[PDB]
Each structure stands twice: as structure tokens, then as C-alpha cells.
Design an enzyme around this catalytic site. Sequence first.
Site, PDB file in Angstrom:
ATOM      1  N   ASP A   1       1.675 -10.624 -12.616  1.00 42.87           N
ATOM      2  CA  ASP A   1       2.143  -9.641 -11.659  1.00 42.87           C
ATOM      3  C   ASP A   1       1.123  -9.439 -10.572  1.00 42.87           C
ATOM      4  OD1 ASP A   1       3.298  -6.164 -11.789  1.00 42.87           O
ATOM      5  OD2 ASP A   1       3.465  -7.727 -10.286  1.00 42.87           O
TER       6      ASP A   1
ATOM      7  N   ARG B   1       0.053  -3.978  -4.609  1.00 44.75           N
ATOM      8  CA  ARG B   1      -0.055  -2.733  -5.357  1.00 44.75           C
ATOM      9  C   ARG B   1      -1.059  -2.830  -6.484  1.00 44.75           C
ATOM     10  NH1 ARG B   1       4.393  -5.695  -5.953  1.00 44.75           N
ATOM     11  NH2 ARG B   1       4.795  -6.404  -8.095  1.00 44.75           N
ATOM     12  N   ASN B   2      -1.286  -4.034  -7.014  1.00 46.75           N
ATOM     13  CA  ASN B   2      -2.262  -4.300  -8.064  1.00 46.75           C
ATOM     14  C   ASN B   2      -3.540  -4.964  -7.532  1.00 46.75           C
ATOM     15  OD1 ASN B   2      -0.443  -3.427 -10.205  1.00 46.75           O
ATOM     16  ND2 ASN B   2       0.580  -5.402  -9.998  1.00 46.75           N
TER      17      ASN B   2
ATOM     18  N   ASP C   1      -4.684  -4.913 -14.177  1.00 45.22           N
ATOM     19  CA  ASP C   1      -3.513  -5.148 -14.959  1.00 45.22           C
ATOM     20  C   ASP C   1      -3.414  -6.619 -15.266  1.00 45.22           C
ATOM     21  OD1 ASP C   1      -2.143  -2.360 -14.435  1.00 45.22           O
ATOM     22  OD2 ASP C   1      -0.722  -3.583 -15.537  1.00 45.22           O
TER      23      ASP C   1
HETATM   24  C1  LIG Z   1      -7.381   8.912  -4.759  1.00 38.23           C
HETATM   25  C2  LIG Z   1      -6.933   7.441  -4.679  1.00 38.23           C
HETATM   26  C3  LIG Z   1      -7.356   6.629  -5.894  1.00 38.23           C
HETATM   27  O1  LIG Z   1      -6.608   5.434  -5.922  1.00 38.23           O
HETATM   28  C4  LIG Z   1      -6.812   4.695  -7.033  1.00 38.23           C
HETATM   29  C5  LIG Z   1      -5.723   4.219  -7.719  1.00 38.23           C
HETATM   30  C6  LIG Z   1      -5.929   3.455  -8.848  1.00 38.23           C
HETATM   31  C7  LIG Z   1      -7.157   3.195  -9.247  1.00 38.23           C
HETATM   32  C8  LIG Z   1      -8.207   3.653  -8.591  1.00 38.23           C
HETATM   33  C9  LIG Z   1      -8.072   4.386  -7.500  1.00 38.23           C
HETATM   34  N1  LIG Z   1      -9.281   3.232  -9.221  1.00 38.23           N
HETATM   35  C10 LIG Z   1      -8.903   2.523 -10.265  1.00 38.23           C
HETATM   36  N2  LIG Z   1      -7.591   2.507 -10.273  1.00 38.23           N
HETATM   37  C11 LIG Z   1      -6.853   1.885 -11.156  1.00 38.23           C
HETATM   38  C12 LIG Z   1      -7.444   1.409 -12.296  1.00 38.23           C
HETATM   39  C13 LIG Z   1      -6.676   0.746 -13.219  1.00 38.23           C
HETATM   40  C14 LIG Z   1      -5.338   0.579 -12.966  1.00 38.23           C
HETATM   41  C15 LIG Z   1      -4.577  -0.084 -13.897  1.00 38.23           C
HETATM   42  C16 LIG Z   1      -3.233  -0.272 -13.678  1.00 38.23           C
HETATM   43  C17 LIG Z   1      -2.669   0.208 -12.517  1.00 38.23           C
HETATM   44  C18 LIG Z   1      -3.422   0.886 -11.574  1.00 38.23           C
HETATM   45  N3  LIG Z   1      -2.815   1.318 -10.459  1.00 38.23           N
HETATM   46  C19 LIG Z   1      -1.416   1.771 -10.498  1.00 38.23           C
HETATM   47  C20 LIG Z   1      -1.116   2.810  -9.470  1.00 38.23           C
HETATM   48  C21 LIG Z   1      -1.652   2.374  -8.154  1.00 38.23           C
HETATM   49  N4  LIG Z   1      -1.156   1.041  -7.822  1.00 38.23           N
HETATM   50  C22 LIG Z   1      -3.132   2.369  -8.261  1.00 38.23           C
HETATM   51  C23 LIG Z   1      -3.528   1.273  -9.180  1.00 38.23           C
HETATM   52  C24 LIG Z   1      -4.782   1.066 -11.805  1.00 38.23           C
HETATM   53  N5  LIG Z   1      -5.560   1.712 -10.934  1.00 38.23           N
HETATM   54  C25 LIG Z   1      -5.557   7.212  -4.179  1.00 38.23           C
HETATM   55  O2  LIG Z   1      -6.149   7.436  -2.874  1.00 38.23           O
HETATM   56  C26 LIG Z   1      -7.335   6.793  -3.392  1.00 38.23           C
END
Ligand SMILES: CC1(COc2ccc3c(c2)ncn3-c2ccc3cccc(N4CCC(N)CC4)c3n2)COC1
Length: 296
Positions: A156, A160-161, A174
Site C-alpha cells: 500500500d 497518505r503513507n 505501514d
Molecule cells: C499534527 C500532525 C501529525 O501528523 C502525523 C501523522 C501521522 C504520524 C505522524 C505525524 N508521525 C507519525 N505518524 C504516523 C506514524 C505511524 C503511522 C502508522 C500508520 C498510519 C499512519 N498515518 C495514518 C494517518 C495519516 N496518514 C498519518 C499517518 C501513521 N502515522 C498532523 O499535522 C501534523
Amino acid sequence: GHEYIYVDPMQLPYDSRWEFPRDGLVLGRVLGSGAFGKVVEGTAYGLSRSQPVMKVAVKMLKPTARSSEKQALMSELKIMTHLGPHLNIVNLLGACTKSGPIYIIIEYCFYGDLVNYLHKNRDSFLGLTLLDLLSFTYQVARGMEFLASKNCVHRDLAARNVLLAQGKIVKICDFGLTFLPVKWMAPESIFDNLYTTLSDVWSYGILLWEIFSLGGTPYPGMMVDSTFYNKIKSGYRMAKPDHATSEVYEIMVKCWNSEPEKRPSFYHLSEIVENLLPGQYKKSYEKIHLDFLKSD
Ligand SMILES: CC1(COc2ccc3c(c2)ncn3-c2ccc3cccc(N4CCC(N)CC4)c3n2)COC1
């Protein structure tokens, strides 16, 4: 050959060198929600020598967690530990596995997923620059070349990832163990149920279209349905994105060969993108690469 057997990481015993205290860890605002599974902002005290107090993200099962779901998280942790660490993936920092629900502590990327970041600076793109796009494209390639190396198929890969950390370092996630990301899957992956490293290269060619159209939905205006499949089988491919150089588009079109064997390796892709980039960036990238390995 009864002798040579496949070492399945998920059977190898957990390494408790990872395990981290739960009174050392503070939960935070939710970052993302999976169908099951969720992530959260986090603060960990004493987790690292380099940073006494540091900002993490934690992956935890949703409250409605069947046991089966519980093992899935541990398996991911075991798959993560086995993979080792690389600069372009979101690395494992620690995990809590005793006397409670499981938590996996992962690196925190300040910017977030490439889709939101790109949308934010669409206007600023003349500020966000073409080199910026090229920088990301190169590190998505490098990260994957590491993943394939470990015989790991993401399944995937998409924007987004792809996450963008402090230092504008892109980290993929992921990568660790139904509705399917159809716009991003190779044909064999839809028709033939074949998932491989060569089909992640497809998804990567879709990722670049995502990048260089500054966050555009794949196959816009086209809804997945019978005609969509009849198109893809016939060889239909997306046109050039507006902001992509003739050179890069060639890169996508290579990634979308109907024949998998024909698709380039990630290692190959890193190379093609390296010659699209100033020599000083490759210097910048190696110094950063060393420094990461030297953290902690
Ligand atoms: C406050 C903010 C913060 O953003 C972020 C988001 C995710 C962040 C992050 C900061 N540090 C890490 N991860 C992660 C880590 C593991 C993940 C494992 C699986 C899926 C993720 N996703 C799914 C939701 C979206 N696509 C974000 C990524 C993951 N994310 C949003 O404005 C910056």
C-alpha cells in the site's frame, strides 16, 4: 533442501531490549485512525539517550479489540524489529508488551503525510519547489530499495503513507502486517492477486503522479467500476502531471509497464532520480544518513 527453511520473523521471540516503561510514556491527541488500530501523539521520558524527553507516536488497538487483533500488533512489532532501521521508514523506538494493552512507539514526523503537506503548499509552489518534489521522490525510492532488500512488500505504497519528518526527511510506514487501494495496485495485483516488489514499483509510479500534481487524486473523474478495469487491462495510463518534468514522467511510464519484469528496480530508481538532483543533495543525504545511524 529440507535443510534450508524460511525464517519467519513472526515466530522469532520478541526482543525485550525494546520494552519500555508505561510510566515513562504519555499518550496524546490522536493522529490517525485505522479500521482497527489508531495512532497517537506521544511523549516519552527516558526513552532516548539523545533526547531525554522526546515526541513520539504510538500505535495501539482500538478499544474494540478482538484477541486476534492483539496478535496482529505483536507480529507487526516482530516484523519491525526484524527489518532493522532505515532513514526513510518510520522506525521503531520502543514497545510496551507486559501487563496491559500493546503499544508500539514510533518516530514522529512533524509535517505529516505527504498528501496534506502538498495541499498546504500548493499555493506556495511559486516556497515549495521542484527540487523539493525531487527530494521526496528520491527518498521514497531509497526507502523502498531498503524495504525490498529485506524482502518486504508494502502493498500500500502511496502518499497518505509517506510521511515528512523534521528535516524534511520522508518516512514510509505501514510496511508491517477487504478493501483495496485500487487506483494504486498493479494489474497482476488486481486480476492475479500477485503482490511483489515489482508491483510496489507500480504503486511508486502512482505516488509520483501524486507528488508532481501537488496532491492529485489518481485517475481523477474516473470511478472504479467495470470500465475502469477494462481500461487498465487494455493498457490505459495517466497522462503527464502538470508539474512533472519530461524526465520524471518517463520514470512513471517505466513503472507502469504491463510486464512486471520490465519495471525498474527501486535500486535502479534511486539512480535515475539521483541524476536528476544536484550533486550536493547526494552529499547532504549521505551525511544525514550517517548521522541517523549514529543517533543514540
Ligand atoms: C499534527 C500532525 C501529525 O501528523 C502525523 C501523522 C501521522 C504520524 C505522524 C505525524 N508521525 C507519525 N505518524 C504516523 C506514524 C505511524 C503511522 C502508522 C500508520 C498510519 C499512519 N498515518 C495514518 C494517518 C495519516 N496518514 C498519518 C499517518 C501513521 N502515522 C498532523 O499535522 C501534523
